[model samples]
Target chain A: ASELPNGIGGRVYLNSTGAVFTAKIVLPETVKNNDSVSTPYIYSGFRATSGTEADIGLQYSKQYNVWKPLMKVGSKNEETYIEGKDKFTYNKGFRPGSTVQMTIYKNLSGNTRMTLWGTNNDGYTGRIITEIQGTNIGTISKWKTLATAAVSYESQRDAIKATFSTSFNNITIDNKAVTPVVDTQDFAKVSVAGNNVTISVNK
Target chain B: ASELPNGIGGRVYLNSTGAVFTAKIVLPETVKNNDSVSTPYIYSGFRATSGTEADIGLQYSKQYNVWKPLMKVGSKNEETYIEGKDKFTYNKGFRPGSTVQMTIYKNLSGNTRMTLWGTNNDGYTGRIITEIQGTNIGTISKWKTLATAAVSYESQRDAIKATFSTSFNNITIDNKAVTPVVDTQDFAKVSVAGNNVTISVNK
Candidate 1:
């Protein structure tokens, strides 16, 4: 492919929880936005190594005229909104190797918040699975239904597709957190030292 | 002043006659290349009605990873680049009027090509000068230098300060023109009718 100059680029670094898998990734620059009217998202995430595909990652969305964080799987499979209980601001500092946990469970109704676990380098497919009421994994939709599908990615080569309208109940970042605001778009910088990781954002 | 979003928005419609005394304007949108490492050029331009300050005008700039055109003048003073050459693509293409002409004259050195001319709405300080020994003002920049410096507004309160580091040989938009690319950022967009302007890129 003739390297096209569309003007989006960045780097991402990821370290596994037990201090095992380590990856430094060159994030895919300008991934298109799910919403045609909105601006595109810039991505970064974790991989086993510089050459390996990203297992898990995040994207900064310019949707709604604000910077919001959305989760990603595989090479360009950006999915689900990680709406912060407190809006994450840009350039807020973050360290590497901090344990990031997402706990999803369901209510009396079928609608579920699926709990998925993984080493930061393990892409979405590689995530260790858990269920609502600790049930067994059956159909793919069973897993998909448990998870939040705020957005979906089919073709790996596709620029970001349509962003579904949705919101999150609760989100916890690293240290201090608050209720999320749906205005200005937010972003963060990540730094790593050995097994320690930090992720910081604007105040 | 309430801080607004960092996106550039404006419009561009020309009048004929070519009597160019250009205003310092923010060109229409969709002009940036979408490269983050590169600094963006936002635009705003105007012509003071009865010398009171521009009563009507538009601006253009590629911003926040997208090409967004916005309204200007008191709404936003998008003073910026005029990157152009031969055919300046206009969305709301204007018809010709009278009083339009450009004059050009140069020094004995001959190495320097000092060109000039234009109307106040042209946004180059309302001048009527010359260059290039009777050469036709075939391009916009050929006639860009004829004007004088008007009042300039500067404030740290402004998220986007005055545009600095100038570069450009000439800029002739829409109808037709020619070129010599310079350093400062550039952008533009035009639509006489409403067919939402959409510039696409990778995922």
Candidate 2:
């Protein structure tokens, strides 16, 4: 009962071995939901190797839309929710300002892949909506230790009254390119144009 | 050494239970490789539940572009390949007519997903170049027995001096829409525009 709507954005803490993690998020017309709203509420973003938090998003709950590979070894999010299984909706792409290119890949053998790309403006026309690879990190174990790449709000209800905005771009890991270190909790606000990271809120 | 490039197209003996299988392929400017030509060759199409053949395109081999989930429970193709691992190329879109929207999905816990889409013409500009989901058929067992939905050439060396042309559109399984059954082996040639299935080769 503790992992309800945890929210944050702008994070990068991989000390060593990393496989892949790409970013370019931009979707937030508004946000706020914690079960009651009927959508378990997922704003999911990237992987966090530390406490076992892995977010790969495009979610609407029961099915309307799902890419929520959302993994968490830290437990307490009610068994950790697996299996968006496969079924896509939401008019083909998530609404709002859609620009998701989110990917969290881990291969070689460890097997862990999650992708979502729906850019080309709002209704999303670009493509690549779901990837969701073989998640055999041996039951979400350390896998590789490439933790955190920020942007959260999975069970989010914590940032109540929270207005929203999320945008992350060109954030690659394993293919090199890094520069994200923004973190938020209270009112949420972080920015950077070069390496690209934007987390806005108006709680 | 029997598995020396078995090839076929337009097959559907899938008897009954099936999870998912989609198609919309159109790419064939050239195709003829048998290992020495440098590509090992993969014109991979879709699942063949019985013989244990499952293909998911966008392959250049060794990794120029890989979606080649390529499974073979029937084995013989020399230890069937896996792990494109990750590294995309071809300027992001596999050239030569482009229009691939191949998918071989099996979810609801059975786990096996493969997708590759790059439409919008040749240099492709649509999206979703790859989507290789967690494959856990327990080492290629008979998962669900949906059997063939062809357009193949995984290790092709058999159809020597072969020419190429592959296109399969709107062929769905589980979501319904079935009409395959075109079967081929020697010189390859099958056409159907309504339900859509085009496998053309010239020797």
Candidate 3:
């Protein structure tokens, strides 16, 4: 399918020194509201590399807008087709070895615009390295997750290190009942990085 | 505006001295296709002493279909609005201290359906982090250069101890342009957690 309408995700696997290892994160059936989208993902963007193999990266599938249908139009002479729904994909996946994962969180108000931010270990906002997007988002009521790939290790040697961070800004909605969003998530576990890698799948 | 059409971007900044350091990222008048959108100003994703101060984040804005009037509804029940318009806005801004940006390239064959694979420091594929739609891709024309903030004193300290590394990977575009994108950046200047802290932007 062109889009991951419901339940469809990929896996990341490593074939190293004649040994194969798999990382852990599984795709959800759909994108849900109030879901913890950070941590368990996003790793350190830098490393010192004295030498040790470590895998670091991400995996994910696009969730299509179920509310809308593909659009279409008709002409007297020919049949025309409009568009329907679209999905957002991530390009921020990384390999596993020495890299660590860092996720940032931002608090938000009901119906308020929110801006979230993060940096890799290198202190560089290397957003240029990972990117993804799509049209038809106004109809999106909740958060849409985007996935990308990253490399934690180049091979079987050298571990990577990076600091993780986050922030929530531009919140126009404010009220006691609205609730304040958090700035970041605590370090869940270093082993959680292994949850991301999976085996390659053939559609 | 509901979204920043395209090519409108910004950066986050950090002023650890605790004196509200002002940060700004200029926006271009008009955006083109395939152009990178946000420029981040990063500040505090890094760890400092318990009381160290810093400020950083992103500056963002949006764009729409350049042809259609931004957004308007007519008096009649039937109204006409332009389709295929995209949006990217940094309402509060891209707070680097709390943000991460991703850059994506399009794959031909007319299907936006794509998956992201992650890798570790050893360069093994890992789990997916996010999955969302792709947007505002009309501004990028050719390859461009992006410079990141310099390494800080604390980060350099880690580098000396061999705990920080800035690694690179080759970007393989399997199209007519047969050459692969090489990682030509330097790693010695990246920040980490070992050596020494000089207390400066670039040590």
Candidate 4:
């Protein structure tokens, strides 16, 4: 079951020793009971240390009284969508210690819209990120870069400081394995082992 | 027009002096909007100094998915409204320096629901303050007390210390005339003339 309606309210933030993480909230389903609408249960965003920015996720909002999904970006604040005619799909699950690599393909002239394709263990999804409406530049193998990291201890350690518990055995980020550590002296006690991270704050 | 869409918001407080003052919120409406639905526009609840606790004021809440008015009290950490068969109505306005007096009649045993009648320059409204579902002990002359104080400067002196202006003629509390004094050495400057008292804070 989903943790909360409206794809989580308030703010969602993650920070680690290397980089800070920010996630756009998943838009809530229009109907109360529509499971087929593709709930993004996984975290999808770029790591801050990667230097290069990329399109993150999609959010559904009312555009001219019609609720349409809009692609979000890592920079340049605007309501612009990825101008493309191609639709890419990926059915992927984010398990513990897994990494999903993403590559970007952009056009040279006019309203430059980019296509982002991500792949992990389960599969991957691809979509165009832009401002102009629908298919200005056709897809080609253009400027490709790696933006992939594991949901590992280093990435999620600072992310789950407020609420962290359970354990994850062998976690890695960008294919580099790292172990999660906890400070018992802090108000919250954090511990990680196997695939679970546990956090406890005593009243 | 109305103070706001949700009637009044922010905090209502009284001082060691005699008058009561209400704040219109220094914070913007958004995250704090949730508390607005539970806010009581009229003078609500009771000060604990009255020796006994009683239910007072009305709040609008969604009961059974429909917005229904609920009577609120000062005590109890939970949201418990008065459940009784007594109905009261008042289309009244609160002005500066005006006082509303209230008296109560209670039953000696069992479920004691008391009738509260308030009188001012205009007519008043009466309602039963009870925990029971219906009217049990009928109305009668009972113990009387003063639950009335103006939203005048006396009750609001300390409450509006940060922001006070204007003045009042022949202002007093407990039969004693009072003149507001401010520390010019500090950030506030206070002055009084007739029934008017003015205060300005500059830091």
Q: For residues B74-193, could you state the per-residue lDDT of candidate 2 as single tens digits?
A: 222212223222322323344555566666655525445555555432343444423323444432222221112121112112223445566667766667766655444335556655
Span of ten consecutive residues with least summed lDDT in model 3 chain A: A67-76
Q: Positional deviation of B202 in candidate 1, in angstroms?
A: 21
- Top-scoring candidate (lDDT): 2
- Tens-place lDDT digits, model 4, residues B1-203: 21112112222221223322111111101111111012222222233344443333322111111111222222322222252222322222222233223222222342333232332113333333333232223332111111111111111111121221222233333344444332222223345453234333221
Candidate 4, residues A1-203, lDDT tens digits: the string is 11221122111222222221221121222212111111222222333343433333332111111112223233332334443223321222222232222222222353333333332223334343444222223322111111111111111111121221112223333333334333222333444453223433211
lDDT of 2 by residue, A50-90 (tens): 44555444443222232232333222121111322222232
Q: What TM-score does model 1 achieve against the real structure?
A: 0.23
Cα TM-score of candidate 4: 0.24
What is the per-residue lDDT of model 1 for residues A62-139, given as tens digits with 9 covering 90 to 100?
Answer: 322222233322233212323322223233211122222344332213222223332232222223222223122121
Q: DockQ score for model 1, please?
A: 0.02
Identify the CAPRI category of the predicted complex in candidate 2: incorrect
DockQ of 3: 0.01
List lDDT for all candidates, in order: 0.23, 0.41, 0.19, 0.25
Per model, the share of native interface contacts recovered reads 0.00, 0.00, 0.00, 0.00
Worst 10 residues of 4 chain B by lDDT: B28-37
**Per-residue lDDT for B165 in model 2?**
63
Q: Write the per-residue lDDT of candidate 3 for residues A62-139, one digit (tens) a residue.
A: 122111001111111111112110111122222222222222111112111111122222332222111111111121
Stretches off by above 4 angstroms in model 1 are: A1-55, A58-194, A201-203, B1-203
